Amino acid sequence: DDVGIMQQKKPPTVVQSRTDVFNEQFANEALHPMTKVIFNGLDVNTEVQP
């Protein structure tokens, strides 16, 4: 129970469905625990407070 210093490991996250017509099929998918983000290239918080 403590905050790690060395960087960890990731799935890693992937973008998918956005537009107003999909027609997805659900082929493949791996079955391993992963992450899927809706918006492309987010993670915006560049402010650093010393």
Partner: peptide, 27 residues
């Protein structure tokens, strides 16, 4: 140092054939 990793080990087993000695023990 940079990235946290994981390693593995397995306890080893060492044995030779029973060697020959020329020195006696008891009377």
């Amino acid at each position: 140092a940079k990235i946290a990793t994981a390693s593995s080990a397995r306890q080893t087993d060492v044995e030779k054939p029973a060697d020959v000695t020329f020195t006696i023990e008891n009377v």
